[PDB]
Scaffold this active site. Sequence first.
Site, mmCIF file in Angstrom:
data_model
loop_
_atom_site.group_PDB
_atom_site.id
_atom_site.type_symbol
_atom_site.label_atom_id
_atom_site.label_comp_id
_atom_site.label_asym_id
_atom_site.label_seq_id
_atom_site.Cartn_x
_atom_site.Cartn_y
_atom_site.Cartn_z
ATOM 1 N N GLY A 141 -14.882 -24.767 12.526
ATOM 2 C CA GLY A 141 -16.012 -24.131 11.879
ATOM 3 C C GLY A 141 -15.571 -23.579 10.543
ATOM 4 O O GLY A 141 -14.396 -23.661 10.166
ATOM 5 N N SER B 48 -17.134 -18.023 11.121
ATOM 6 C CA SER B 48 -17.989 -18.810 11.989
ATOM 7 C C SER B 48 -17.817 -18.442 13.454
ATOM 8 O O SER B 48 -18.468 -19.040 14.315
ATOM 9 C CB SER B 48 -17.700 -20.297 11.793
ATOM 10 O OG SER B 48 -16.362 -20.596 12.166
ATOM 11 N N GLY B 49 -16.952 -17.480 13.753
ATOM 12 C CA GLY B 49 -16.688 -17.107 15.124
ATOM 13 C C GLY B 49 -15.842 -18.092 15.894
ATOM 14 O O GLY B 49 -15.825 -18.042 17.121
ATOM 15 N N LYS B 50 -15.135 -18.993 15.205
ATOM 16 C CA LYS B 50 -14.358 -20.004 15.910
ATOM 17 C C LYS B 50 -13.196 -19.386 16.683
ATOM 18 O O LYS B 50 -12.851 -19.873 17.766
ATOM 19 C CB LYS B 50 -13.853 -21.067 14.927
ATOM 20 C CG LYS B 50 -13.106 -20.526 13.689
ATOM 21 C CD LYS B 50 -12.960 -21.620 12.616
ATOM 22 C CE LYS B 50 -12.034 -21.213 11.482
ATOM 23 N NZ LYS B 50 -12.622 -20.128 10.656
ATOM 24 N N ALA C 33 0.878 -19.110 16.889
ATOM 25 C CA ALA C 33 0.408 -18.646 15.591
ATOM 26 C C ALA C 33 1.194 -19.343 14.492
ATOM 27 O O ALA C 33 2.420 -19.197 14.408
ATOM 28 C CB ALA C 33 0.551 -17.132 15.467
ATOM 29 N N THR C 34 0.485 -20.081 13.637
ATOM 30 C CA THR C 34 1.105 -20.872 12.587
ATOM 31 C C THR C 34 1.166 -20.140 11.251
ATOM 32 O O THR C 34 1.391 -20.774 10.214
ATOM 33 C CB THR C 34 0.351 -22.185 12.423
ATOM 34 O OG1 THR C 34 -0.963 -21.907 11.927
ATOM 35 C CG2 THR C 34 0.231 -22.879 13.761
ATOM 36 N N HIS D 137 -2.484 -6.357 9.933
ATOM 37 C CA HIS D 137 -2.895 -5.986 11.281
ATOM 38 C C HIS D 137 -3.292 -7.220 12.085
ATOM 39 O O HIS D 137 -4.089 -8.046 11.631
ATOM 40 C CB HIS D 137 -4.056 -4.992 11.211
ATOM 41 C CG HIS D 137 -4.414 -4.381 12.531
ATOM 42 N ND1 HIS D 137 -5.595 -4.660 13.184
ATOM 43 C CD2 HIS D 137 -3.749 -3.499 13.316
ATOM 44 C CE1 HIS D 137 -5.643 -3.980 14.316
ATOM 45 N NE2 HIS D 137 -4.534 -3.268 14.421
ATOM 46 N N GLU E 9 5.366 -17.532 17.186
ATOM 47 C CA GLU E 9 5.255 -17.680 15.737
ATOM 48 C C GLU E 9 6.037 -18.913 15.311
ATOM 49 O O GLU E 9 7.266 -18.948 15.439
ATOM 50 C CB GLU E 9 5.798 -16.452 15.012
ATOM 51 C CG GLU E 9 4.966 -15.184 15.106
ATOM 52 C CD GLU E 9 5.542 -14.044 14.266
ATOM 53 O OE1 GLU E 9 6.631 -14.213 13.670
ATOM 54 O OE2 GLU E 9 4.902 -12.976 14.201
#
Lengths: 178, 178, 178
Positions: free
Chosen positions: A9, A13-15, A34-35, A45, A57
Amino acid sequence: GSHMTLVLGGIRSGKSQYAEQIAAGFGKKILYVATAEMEYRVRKHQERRPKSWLTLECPRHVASAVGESGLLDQVDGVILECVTLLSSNTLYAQKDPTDYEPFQEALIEEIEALKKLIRQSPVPWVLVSSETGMGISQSDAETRHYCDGLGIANQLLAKSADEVYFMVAGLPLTVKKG
Amino acid sequence: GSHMTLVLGGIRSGKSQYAEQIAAGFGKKILYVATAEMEYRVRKHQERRPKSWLTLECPRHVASAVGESGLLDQVDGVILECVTLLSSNTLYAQKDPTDYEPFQEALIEEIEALKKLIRQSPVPWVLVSSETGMGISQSDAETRHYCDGLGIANQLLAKSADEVYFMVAGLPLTVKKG
Amino acid sequence: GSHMTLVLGGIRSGKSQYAEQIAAGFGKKILYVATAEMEYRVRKHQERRPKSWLTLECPRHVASAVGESGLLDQVDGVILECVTLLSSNTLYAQKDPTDYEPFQEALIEEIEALKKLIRQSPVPWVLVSSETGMGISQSDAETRHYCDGLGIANQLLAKSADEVYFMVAGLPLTVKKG
């Protein structure tokens, strides 16, 4: 409850929330991959994600890192956040970002490795990506190349995925469902 | 025939015509709430909307103005044109538009007031908004902030709305229907 | 198997491959109408399209050229690639591209001629166009005008078409089907 889910999205877009709900549907222990990108580190944060979730990570060579970690054997599911930043990291690490070929081939190698891993994975995956190709044609060559590469990555992932959702104003449109 | 309808789409997507047809479905007397912007006034040519429709010009604090007018008690329905210009007016009225927090909070207060009014409204509402988050990431900080804020507003409205339509080339895709 | 098909989508959305599959569904001999732009010519590598397909190069006045060629009487179907470049050619051929009215009227004359031809056509048509209106509002007046004009063309074509598909990451969402 499919094996591979792609949620894409636009901006706001709330994806992320929707993909996180799919991942919560996977189970209680989720691998949040997490990329994102001398002596110390400053951090923006982070999102308030569940306590039992483990965070991995890895800004580049995502499939290699996740496979090497072995963590696919201690969790119930994987949420990849996000294909967008992975493309960005692959572009900004080339010698010349105004050149298209190396960045394109490196991102395709990255996406093919992810497809291989997910196919061979014991747990299911939901992946988050952005739609950036429905705007005015940008002028910058680096930017046009990035947009083209992200879109190619999204095609490859959508084809390999079992379920594909396209987010509009927080709500999902089903593009593909088995 | 739902209580709250959100029609969103891109540039030249036919969202106005479709929302106006929904509103004509509301009844014959419709409140067209227009959020557009010393001695005189110059005006661009207005759309040829029905004769029985009453037009309410309020560029800011839309819920307050519509409630104070009392006009919800003399019409059959409301068409709000449009969330896009309301976000624009909220941004350009801050002291520093390159700052995000005040504009974001003011627009959220505005959207929450609209949600409250519509929930307490005797007549139904169709609201018009734009999709602006599926393009290349713009460079301007004011522009990125505006895009983020409009997208948040669209999420809040889509969640409160009973029906949500996304316009592509004049035709609606149903995102949400009760 | 409809008479007029419109496939639209963003950058790297797979719209060309999908429209080409629809056209292959038309039959074995397909008219590929290409709207692309002193002594010699240099050419970028062309897509590897089927051997029995005939290619018609016409950057402007597409309906006139296709009708004059007579080739609608020797093929099984038509794929038009693409409405985007046709709009671009119509804009860049005006005297002042920062002016909106002449470009708009010329593109509307072009699209109306195409609608007429397709309605009077013995073979079916699949047309390829781009979605460019869901990004940030661009600053350039020429660019804003182009975006507005392409979007109007897409509305007119979607309304005349029997089937309309919107491409997300290579997969089609059905907007309209008879």
